[PDB]
C-alpha cells in the first residue's frame, strides 16, 4: 500500500533526523550566522556552496555530505558554464528538492537529512537574506528570519521567537543563538558566517580565539 | 521490519569482530606504536598506507585486506595527482567510513571488520598524533590516546586506561601494550611503529632480534 509505505518512510526519516545534533541559522546585520553543535573536529555540518551561498544540514553524515558534494559540483559547473552571478541559492534549493523528492520515492531507504540553503546579497548591493529549508520528503519552505534543524527543534524555535531581533550585531546574534541552542564552549561549537561585506566569497568560519572573544 | 533486521545485521557484524584477535595502537613520544596478536607469519593486520599514515584492522581478513588495498590505491592516486603532502589521514578515514556505510546499507552481508587509521606529523613538524577508529556501520570516532580493536576489548582498554602515560618511550609503551594485551612471545606478535623521526616514510616493522631486545 502506497499510504503505508509513505507513512513508514516519513516516520523513519523523522526519527532519524531528531536523532542528531541541532543547527541554527539566523539572519543578522552583516548577513547570515551559522551556529552548530559539533563535538567532532574533522566532520563539519556547515560548508560553503558558492560565493554567496552557504550550506547547513542535520542528520546522517554520509548522506548530506554526498548531497553537499553534488551541490558544489552543480554550482561550479553552472558558474563556469555561464557566469558566477548566474548561480543563485534558489536554483540550488530547487535541485536539492528534486533530488530528495526522487530519493524519497525511488530508493529503498529515504535520506534522513534536513538541508538549509542561505544566500546573501552581492557586494555593494541591498537585499534581504534568503533562507531555504528542504526536508526529507522534498518540500521546500522559505524562512524569513531563522531556521532550526536537528534534535528538539521546538524549544529552540520557541526561544528564538522571543529573543530574535532584526539588524542585530554579530555578537548579539551569536549570544542569542547560543542561548537558544542550550535550551556551550568553543570545543563543541561550529560557527561560520556569510559576511555580506566580503568582496567575493562571503563564507568565513569563526574558530579559535576569535570565536572565544565573541562569546 | 527492516529496522529489527538491522539489529541482526549489527549483531552478525559484532560477532564477526569478536571472533578474532586483538590489536592495540597507542601514541607515544616517537609517534604511534602498533601491537597485534598475530600467530600467522604470512598474513598481516598492520600495514602502511602512505608516508605518514598507518593502517590497523581486525575482523574478516578477505574484507579488510581489500579495504587496505583500496585505501593504498586511493592514497597513491591522490599523491600523484596533486602532491604527497596533500594526502591526509582524515581523507582516508572519510573514504573508509563512506565505503563501510555503503556496504552496510546495500550489500547482503556487512563487512565484519574494524579499521584504525593513524597519522603522525611530518619531519621537522610538531603535532599530536591523530587516531581514528572506523566501525562496520560507518561511524568514525577520534581516540586521543589509544585504540583497541578485536576480541574482548574491555579488559585491555581498562588496563590501558590505568597504565597509559603520554610521552612514554618506545620500550615503556611496548611493555604497557603487551601487558594490557595479555589481560606474548616474538613468534606470535606483529609490531610496527609510525616513527615521526623518520624523514619521509614513517612506517617500520620491528621483528626478530630487535623486537626480542625491545621486550
Amino acid at each position: 500500500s502506497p499510504e503505508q509505505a509513505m507513512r513508514e518512510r516519513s516516520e523513519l526519516a523523522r526519527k532519524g533526523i531528531a536523532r542528531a545534533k541541532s543547527v541554527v541559522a539566523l539572519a543578522y546585520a552583516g548577513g547570515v550566522l551559522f551556529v552548530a553543535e559539533n563535538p567532532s573536529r574533522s566532520l563539519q555540518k556547515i560548508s560553503e556552496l558558492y560565493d554567496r551561498v552557504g550550506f547547513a544540514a542535520a542528520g546522517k553524515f554520509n548522506e548530506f555530505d554526498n548531497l553537499r558534494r553534488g551541490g558544489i559540483q552543480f554550482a561550479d559547473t553552472r558558474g563556469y558554464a555561464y557566469d558566477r552571478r548566474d548561480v543563485t541559492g534558489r536554483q540550488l534549493a530547487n535541485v536539492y528538492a528534486q533530488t530528495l523528492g526522487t530519493i524519497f520515492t525511488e530508493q529503498a531507504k529515504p535520506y534522513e537529512v534536513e538541508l538549509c540553503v542561505a544566500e546573501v546579497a552581492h557586494y555593494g548591493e541591498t537585499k534581504r537574506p534568503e533562507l531555504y529549508r528542504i526536508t526529507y520528503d522534498g518540500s521546500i519552505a522559505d524562512e524569513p528570519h531563522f531556521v532550526v534543524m536537528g534534535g528538539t527543534t521546538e524549544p529552540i524555535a520557541n526561544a528564538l521567537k522571543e529573543s530574535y531581533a532584526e539588524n542585530a550585531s554579530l555578537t548579539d546574534a551569536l549570544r542569542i543563538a547560543v542561548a537558544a541552542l542550550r535550551a556551550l564552549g568553543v570545543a563543541s561549537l561550529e560557527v561560520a558566517v556569510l559576511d555580506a561585506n566580503r568582496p567575493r566569497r562571503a563564507f568565513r568560519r569563526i574558530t579559535g580565539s576569535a570565536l572565544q572573544a565573541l562569546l | 521490519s527492516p529496522e529489527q533486521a538491522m539489529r541482526e545485521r549489527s549483531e552478525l557484524a559484532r560477532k564477526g569482530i569478536a571472533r578474532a584477535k586483538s590489536v592495540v595502537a597507542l601514541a607515544y613520544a616517537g609517534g604511534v606504536l602498533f601491537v597485534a596478536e598475530n600467530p600467522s607469519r604470512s598474513l598481516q593486520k598492520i600495514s602502511e598506507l602512505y608516508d605518514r599514515v598507518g593502517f590497523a584492522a581486525a575482523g574478516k581478513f578477505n574484507e579488510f585486506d581489500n579495504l587496505r588495498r583500496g585505501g593504498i590505491q586511493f592514497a597513491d592516486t591522490r599523491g600523484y595527482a596533486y602532491d604527497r603532502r596533500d594526502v591526509t589521514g582524515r581523507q582516508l578515514a572519510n573514504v573508509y567510513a563512506q565505503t563501510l556505510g555503503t556496504i552496510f546499507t546495500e550489500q547482503a552481508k556487512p563487512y565484519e571488520v574494524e579499521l584504525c587509521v593513524a597519522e603522525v606529523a611530518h619531519y621537522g613538524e610538531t603535532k599530536r598524533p591523530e587516531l581514528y577508529r572506523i566501525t562496520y556501520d560507518g561511524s568514525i570516532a577520534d581516540e586521543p590516546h589509544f585504540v583497541v580493536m578485536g576480541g574482548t576489548t574491555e579488559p585491555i582498554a581498562n588496563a590501558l586506561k590505568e597504565s597509559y602515560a603520554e610521552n612514554a618511550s618506545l620500550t615503556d609503551a611496548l611493555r604497557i601494550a603487551v601487558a594490557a594485551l595479555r589481560a606474548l612471545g616474538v613468534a606470535s606478535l606483529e609490531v610496527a611503529v609510525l616513527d615521526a623521526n623518520r624523514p619521509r616514510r614513517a612506517f617500520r616493522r620491528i621483528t626478530g632480534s630487535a623486537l626480542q631486545a625491545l621486550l
Binding site: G16, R19, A20, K21, N38, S40, L43, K45, A58, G59, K60, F61, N62, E112, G150 | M6, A97, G101, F104, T135, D137, G138, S139, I140
Partner: peptide, 5 residues
C-alpha cells in the same frame, strides 16, 4: 546504525 550529526 551510527554517525548521525
Amino acid at each position: 546504525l551510527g554517525q548521525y550529526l
